[PDB]
Amino acid sequence: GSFVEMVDNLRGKSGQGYYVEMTVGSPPQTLNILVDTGSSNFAVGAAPHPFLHRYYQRQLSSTYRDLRKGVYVPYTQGKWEGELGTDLVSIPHGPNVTVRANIAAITESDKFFINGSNWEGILGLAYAEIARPDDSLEPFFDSLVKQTHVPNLFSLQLCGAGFPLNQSEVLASVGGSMIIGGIDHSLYTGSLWYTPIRREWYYEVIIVRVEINGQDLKMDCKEYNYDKSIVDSGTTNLRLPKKVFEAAVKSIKAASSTEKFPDGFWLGEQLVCWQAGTTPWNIFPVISLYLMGEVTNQSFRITILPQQYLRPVEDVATSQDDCYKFAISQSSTGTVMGAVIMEGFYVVFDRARKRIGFAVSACHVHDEFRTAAVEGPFVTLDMEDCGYN
Numbered sequence: 581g582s583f584v585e586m587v588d589n590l591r592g593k594s595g596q597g598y599y600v601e602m603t604v605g606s607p608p609q610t611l612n613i614l615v616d617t618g619s620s621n622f623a624v625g626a627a628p629h630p631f632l633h634r635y636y637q638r639q640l641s642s643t644y645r646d647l648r649k650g651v652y653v654p655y656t657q658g659k660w661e662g663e664l665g666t667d668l669v670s671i672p673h674g675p676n677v678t679v680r681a682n683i684a685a686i687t688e689s690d691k692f693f694i695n696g697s698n699w700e701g702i703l704g705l706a707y708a709e710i711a712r713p714d715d716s717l718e719p720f721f722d723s724l725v726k727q728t729h730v731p732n733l734f735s736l737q738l739c740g741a742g743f744p745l746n747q748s749e750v751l752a753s754v755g756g757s758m759i760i761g762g763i764d765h766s767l768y769t770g771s772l773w774y775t776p777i778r779r780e781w782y783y784e785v786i787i788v789r790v791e792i793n794g795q796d797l798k799m800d801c802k803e804y805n806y807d808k809s810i811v812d813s814g815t816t817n818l819r820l821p822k823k824v825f826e827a828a829v830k831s832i833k834a835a836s837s838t839e840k841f842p843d844g845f846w847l848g849e850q851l852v853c854w855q856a857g858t859t860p861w862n863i864f865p866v867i868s869l870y871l872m873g874e875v876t877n878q879s880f881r882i883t884i885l886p887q888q889y890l891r892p893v894e895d896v897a898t899s900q901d902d903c904y905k906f907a908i909s910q911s912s913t914g915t916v917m918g919a920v921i922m923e924g925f926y927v928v929f930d931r932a933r934k935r936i937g938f939a940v941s942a943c944h945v946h947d948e949f950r951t952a953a954v955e956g957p958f959v960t961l962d963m964e965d966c967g968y969n
C-alpha cells in the first residue's frame with residue numbers, strides 16, 4: 581500500500597547518478613551511496629581523495645571486520661581498487677534494520693569519484709554472480725534479505741527534473757524513491773506490466789521489438805539483445821548494440837529532419853540549445869521497446885519521449901537557453917536501459933518472483949500532447965529466439 585518513510589529518499593540526476601543515504605560502522609558514519617542495479621559490490625571511499633568530502637574510516641569503527649582480501653575492479657571508463665571487510669550498515673530512510681554486510685573499502689581509484697557528484701560509494705544491487713572478486717562475496721541486498729524480514733523485492737522511482745540543476749539545487753531537490761521491500765502505489769499511474777528476469781546475474785531482460793514513431797526498426801530481434809539486455813541505474817544513457825544504434829540513429833534523424841544537427845550531437849558529445857521554452861519536442865520521435873511478457877506469446881511495450889532521451893545540461897556559455905545532450909549511445913556489451921529510460925517509469929525489481937515490472941512514472945517529464953506509456957498485451961511468437969547464447 582504505502583511505505584511513507586522511504587518516499588523521497590533519493591537525490592541526484594541522470595548525469596551524476598542517483599544516491600541514497602547510508603550509515604556504516606559503530607558509531608554510524610554517514611555516506612551517500614550510488615544506487616546501482618548494474619553491479620553487485622557495496623563499495624565505499626575509504627581514504628582521502630580530492631573529490632570526496634568524507635569517507636569510511638575503519639579504525640573508528642569498533643564493529644569493523646577485516647576480511648584480509650584485496651579486490652581489483654577495472655572497467656572501460658574507470659576503475660577502483662580496495663580492501664574487503666564487513667561492518668554494520670543501515671539505511672536511515674529505509675526499513676528499521678541494521679545488518680552485517682560486506683564492504684569493499686576503496687583505497688585507490690581512477691575516473692570513479694567525479695568532481696562534486698555528491699556520492700562517496702556505490703550500492704551494487706545485482707546478483708552474486710557478477711560480484712568481485714567472485715560470487716562467494718554476498719551482495720548487500722542478499723545480506724539484508726537473509727538477516728531480516730524484508731521481502732525479496734525493491735522498486736525505483738528515479739525523477740529527472742526536465743532542466744538543469746546547479747549543485748545547491750541538486751542537494752536540495754528530491755530525486756526519487758527507492759522502496760526497499762515493497763511497491764508504493766503513489767509513484768506510478770496505470771498498471772504494472774512484468775517482464776521475466778532471464779538470468780540472475782545482471783538484471784537481464786529480453787527485447788522483442790523496437791519502434792520509432794510506430795515504425796518497426798525491423799531488425800532480427802537477436803540484435804536487440806546482443807549480447808545481453810539489462811536494466812541498469814548506474815549507467816546514464818540508453819545504450820544500444822552498434823547495429824541497433826546505427827539503425828535507430830538513422831530513424832531518429834529521418835523523423836526529426838526538419839532541423840539538422842552537428843554529428844557531434846548524435847555521438848552524444850556536444851549539446852544543442854534552443855531559446856527558452858521553444859524546444860521542438862514534437863519533431864523528435866517516440867521510442868517503444870517491446871519486452872517479453874509473463875504469459876506465453878504475449879509481450880508489452882514501454883514508450884519513451886524525447887523528454888527522456890534528450891538529457892538537460894547547463895549551457896557552455898551563460899544563457900537562458902534550454903540545452904540538451906543526446907542520451908542514446910553505442911554499446912559493445914549489449915542493450916543497457918540506463919537512468920534516462922528509467923526516469924520515465926516506476927521500475928519494480930521483483931527478485932522473489934524473478935521479474936521486473938514497469939509502470940508510467942508519476943514524476944516523468946512530458947508535454948501537453950504526449951506522455952510515456954506502458955501498454956499491452958501484444959501477440960508475439962518465438963520470443964525465446966530473441967535471447968542470445
Ligand SMILES: NC1=N[C@]23CC[C@H](NC(=O)c4cccc(Cl)c4)C[C@@H]2[C@@H](COC3)S1
Pocket residue numbers: 594595596597598616617618619655692702812813814815816919
Ligand atoms: N552499472 C555500472 N556500475 C559501475 C559503477 C558505477 C559507474 N557509474 C558512475 O560512476 C555513474 C556516473 C554518472 C552517472 C551514473 Cl548513472 C553513474 C559505472 C560502472 C560501470 C561498470 O560497473 C561498475 S556500469
